From a paper:
Human CoVs [name] and OC43 (subgenus Embecovirus, genus Betacoronavirus) are related but distinct. A second type of envelope protein unique to embecoviruses, called the haemagglutinin-esterase (HE), serves as a receptor-destroying enzyme. However, OC43 and [name], subject to convergent evolution, lost HE lectin function. In [name], HE lectin function was also lost, but here the LD underwent several deletions.
Here we present the structure of [name] HE at a global resolution of 3.4 Å. The quality of the map permitted modelling of residues 15–346. Each protomer is stabilised by six disulfide bonds, the presence of which are corroborated by the cryo-EM density. Dimerisation of [name] HE is achieved by interaction of the vestigial LDs and the membrane-proximal domains (MP). Indeed, comparison of the membrane-proximal domain and esterase domain of [name] to these related proteins revealed a high-level of structural conservation, with the aligned Cα positions having RMSD values of 0.81 Å and 0.76 Å for MCoV-New-Jersey strain (MCoV-NJ), and 0.83 Å and 0.84 Å for BCoV-Mebus strain. The lectin domain jelly roll core is essentially conserved in [name], with RMSD values of 0.95 Å and 0.89 Å for BCoV and MCoV-NJ, respectively. However, whereas in BCoV and MCoVs extensive loops emanate from this jelly roll core to form the LD carbohydrate-binding site (CBS), such loops are either much shorter or absent in the [name] HE structure. Thus, [name] has lost all essential components of the HE CBS and the LD domain has been stripped back essentially to the jelly roll core. Compared to related embecoviruses, the LD of [name] has four unique N-linked glycosylation sites: N110, N145, N168 and N193, two of which localise to the remnants of the elongated β5-β6 loop and β7-β10 loop. Interestingly, the disordered portion of these glycans forms a crown of glycan density, which encircles the LD and covers much of its surface.
Numbering used by the authors:
A (entry chain B), B (entry chain A): 15 to 346
The structure:
């Protein structure tokens, strides 16, 4: 037996959050209409256990108008996304700003996402309804991405928004640069969630996990910055960690380390290719090492460890540290 | 092999947070000066790996003048405390109040404590220094317990307190009944921590985990409620869960379920006696089942699971679910 650098599952209940490298609906918008762009084995399209869009991550769909309603449910959860918001995209809001605080926003968003998806099993995006108020206010623009989450409104009063139906949410709380402090005060219970931005040049965010109540917003600022899209975590289950595959570009383009900083123990197992990224369909689709990683979905396993995935459960060479499931031993 | 209902350790680096049932200095204040009151095996006094006081829990030492500076360091952490703040003590602040919100405060405190001690290894109590301001204000009293954490002061301005030296703190943020909102705004970074109390009759608390910065307090209230004691978590290590033994009274006295509600997976393993509590030294010291539980400290083991502790690592009967360490298998 040997630990394997794959992502897998223990039973028939798993789910994958994919992208254009795992999109079975991406063939309807290509020129060469084959299956040579998928990083997964192409017999996995008929499951319904894969949510994937033509060039959408969960962060990009969460903040921006380039939207795909991800929806999934499963015990073991595997992610393959994050290639659609990188230092390659150079996203800012005003030319004196920067994108490193956007990479910190990506780290905080995926940290909150793995930390909540290790405990819940259902995931979808929900909207935040309001009245017909002052609709938007264009404070950020970059000609390649335009965000709607969060809304910017001239303050003048305390707005309200309710949350029901779900079990645990994930809204943003974003500010540019101030001495002020926006709050998401709960009317029913009384729990207060706040954030300020002192020294971060561009639009800094944190990602709180709200409960299904009714919330008001108060900031004492010229612009309250209030969300319009939020996640939805349902059907709280027993603790199952969330697996990652390192979704990055080719080395001629930019990359980051955000999916490894956000993926920490015990709630998360990070799988990375050892070699570089050499595509098959084009430069940026179909690497053989990532086919070797994603090929573990095709079969049940016994154990899931921090160092690898174990197929059989008789014995093994190295000890499974931070193991999960029916796991073999290394004693003679 | 068989899973055991004990608490144990994997190497020479462990620590126990005890009480008067595990206090080797409690013999200097007794009448019958023997070792028949310890729930542990009495050859463990010379380690320095046990912190324990004559009738102090960590919650009681954290809020009240009945104080013991707990100090410990270790990889595997075992608790045996919580018998010193129960529904047997009937603690309130004003006769129209209640102690069930104090049991909710105990649940939230121990949840924050296990969640942080699963990742750090050093634990001690620190003080919060101030100027010579208005010293106290007696808002709560119960003739058996008098708390100093938090201080109550007529507001009149925004106070400041700094935190340095440590790596991660744990301060309270407590209020009685208001429509107002106290905050612990960070001057340096800008992170805001707040809480309000709408419908909870007695002094409700939440326990935030501050970073070592400099914090100001603003509430817009007649009384800001500001801490004077805080925990200190140092030397961040790799994830090791924190073990609990169910520290309760005898059944003729009151009990609770707080140490089982606060101890949830994956960060915590809860060990409980199956039978009742029949003491040996008196009614409330030295049960044979808790001697059987605490006797696992005397020897190294291989695995630590949610269902039991495994000594050898050849094979076992049932599968170790949520295991930890060098763990055996159950495949034939
Ligand atoms: C998953 O695993 C892969 C490995 O397969 C990791 O890829 C490595 O990523 C790091 C950074 O992300 C790379 O380090 C950088 O190397 C540059 C030079 O690389 C040349 O040499 C290598 C062989 O050594 C060639 O393969 C490669 O094609 C290049 O020809 C340096 O110039 C970089 O330094 C610059 O950036 C840093 C960033 O902080 C600055 O501090 C420096 O001052 C400088 O400006 C950098 O050191 C590494 O080369 C990659 N390896 C390979 C084999 O490609 C992934 O990072 C990993 N995934 C995660 C999430 O960690
Ligand atoms: C660790 O494991 C021990 C078991 O060894 C648990 O102890 C049990 O604790 C629960 C509650 O904490 C007890 O349930 C209560 O039982 C009362 C009657 O008990 C009699 O009968 C048992 C045998 O069945 C005798 O052993 C016992 O001495 C008594 O003679 C009920 O009257 C209680 O109901 C009342 O309180 C509840 C509280 O919500 C109300 O809702 C009810 O309406 C009612 O007012 C209650 O059901 C149980 O008896 C204990 N077992 C034993 C063997 O003593 C520990 O709780 C566990 N530790 C943790 C943290 O869970
Ligand atoms: C992203 O996708 C998710 C899931 O795909 C989605 O959440 C779902 O939204 C739908 C509607 O958008 C919800 O469906 C409603 O559920 C309630 C409660 O069960 C029903 O009463 C509703 O029925 C009424 O409306 C029907 C027509 O829609 C009528 O036929 C009927 O007679 C009723 O009048 C309705 O079915 C659903 O509850 C949620 N949640 C789940 C878990 O499915 C989410 O809204 C999407 N978000 C975005 C931004 O696209
Ligand atoms: C609970 O207990 C903990 C640990 O027992 C305790 O934390 C420690 O407090 C002491 C002092 O109370 C700290 O010791 C100081 O550390 C600094 C930095 O190393 C030294 O520079 C200091 O030395 C000065 O003072 C000495 C006399 O105390 C002089 O001899 C010397 O020349 C210097 O002038 C001093 O040793 C210590 O750093 C902390 N932390 C740790 C990890 O030990 C905590 O204060 C206690 N809390 C309560 C409420 O009792
Ligand atoms: C991994 O383990 C799971 C364990 O559930 C396997 O799922 C189960 O696979 C068997 C294969 O024979 C399914 O039985 C078949 O069911 C269909 C109807 O669903 C029936 O028409 C067939 O004749 C056969 O009886 C079983 O239903 C299925 N369990 C489910 C879906 O809950 C899974 O196949 C294993 N392998 C992989 C690669 O996932
Ligand atoms: C559980 O495992 C740990 C693994 O570290 C054991 O600790 C080690 O025990 C040996 C026992 O021989 C110690 O060796 C002795 O060291 C002393 C000096 O410390 C020396 O005087 C003796 O002659 C002997 O060589 C070893 O130091 C110790 N490791 C430490 C302290 O880091 C432990 O004994 C095992 N058992 C239990 C019940 O904990
Ligand atoms: C290890 O577990 C496998 C599970 O089937 C046992 O069966 C062996 O499986 C391998 C690969 O699937 C085959 O190459 C062997 O021929 C199988 N052996 C037999 C006897 O059928 C295997 O016996 C187990 N090894 C042990 C318990 O030592
Ligand atoms: C299981 O592990 C033990 C670890 O020592 C092996 O040794 C046995 O230990 C038990 C209890 O300590 C003794 O009763 C046996 O006599 C020991 N056996 C031998 C051969 O010394 C034991 O061999 C292992 N069992 C396996 C691998 O099946
Ligand atoms: C912002 O960018 C503009 C672009 O020319 C520059 O003139 C200006 O100095 C920068 N800084 C501020 C504070 O406006
Ligand atoms: C705006 O929404 C609030 C939500 O509580 C509601 O009370 C109010 O009537 C709405 N106003 C309009 C004009 O729809
Ligand atoms: C915010 O505070 C800083 C320092 O206190 C000050 O320099 C700056 O002018 C303030 N900005 C506003 C809009 O008050
Ligand atoms: C509080 O307790 C006192 C004790 O007698 C009682 O008179 C009073 O009605 C109670 N309630 C309030 C709101 O003061
Ligand atoms: C009170 O403490 C603050 C801390 O910043 C300090 O600035 C101030 O001088 C102190 N006042 C007195 C009277 O000690
Ligand atoms: C707090 O709010 C409630 C309901 O809004 C009200 O009944 C109560 O009088 C308020 N208390 C104070 C001190 O304003």
């Amino acid at each position: 037996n040997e630990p394997l650098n794959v992502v897998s599952h223990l039973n028939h209940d798993w789910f994958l959050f994919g992208d254009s490298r795992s999109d079975c609906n991406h063939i309807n918008n290509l020129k060469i209409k084959n299956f040579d762009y998928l990083d997964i084995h192409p017999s996995l399209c008929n499951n319904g256990k894969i949510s994937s869009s033509a060039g959408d991550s969960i962060f990009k769909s969460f903040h921006f108008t380039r939207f795909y309603n991800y929806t999934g449910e499963g015990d073991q959860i595997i992610f393959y996304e994050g290639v659609n918001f990188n230092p390659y995209h150079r996203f800012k809001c005003f030319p004196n700003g920067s994108n490193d605080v956007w990479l910190l926003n990506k780290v905080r968003f995926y940290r909150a996402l793995y930390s909540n998806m290790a405990f819940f099993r259902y995931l979808t995006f929900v909207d935040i309804p309001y009245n017909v108020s002052l609709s938007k206010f264009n404070s950020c623009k970059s000609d390649i991405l335009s965000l709607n989450n969060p809304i910017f409104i001239n303050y003048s009063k305390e707005v309200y928004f309710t949350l029901l139906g779900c079990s645990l949410y994930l809204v943003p709380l974003c500010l540019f640069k101030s001495n002020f402090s926006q709050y998401y005060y709960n009317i029913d219970t009384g729990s207060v969630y706040g954030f300020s931005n002192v020294v971060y040049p561009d639009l800094d965010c944190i990602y709180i996990s709200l409960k299904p109540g009714s919330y008001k917003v108060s900031t004492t600022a010229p612009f309250l910055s209030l969300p319009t899209k939020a996640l939805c975590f349902d059907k709280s289950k027993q603790f199952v960690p969330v697996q990652v595959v390192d979704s990055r570009w080719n080395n001629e383009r930019a990359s980051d380390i955000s999916l490894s900083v956000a993926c920490q123990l015990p709630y998360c197992y990070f799988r990375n290719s050892s070699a570089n990224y050499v595509g098959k369909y084009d430069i940026n689709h179909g690497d053989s090492g990532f086919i070797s990683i994603l090929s573990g979905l095709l079969y049940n396993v016994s154990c899931i460890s921090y160092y690898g995935v174990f197929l059989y459960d008789n014995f093994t060479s190295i000890w499974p540290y931070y193991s999960f499931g029916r796991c073999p031993t290394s004693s003679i």
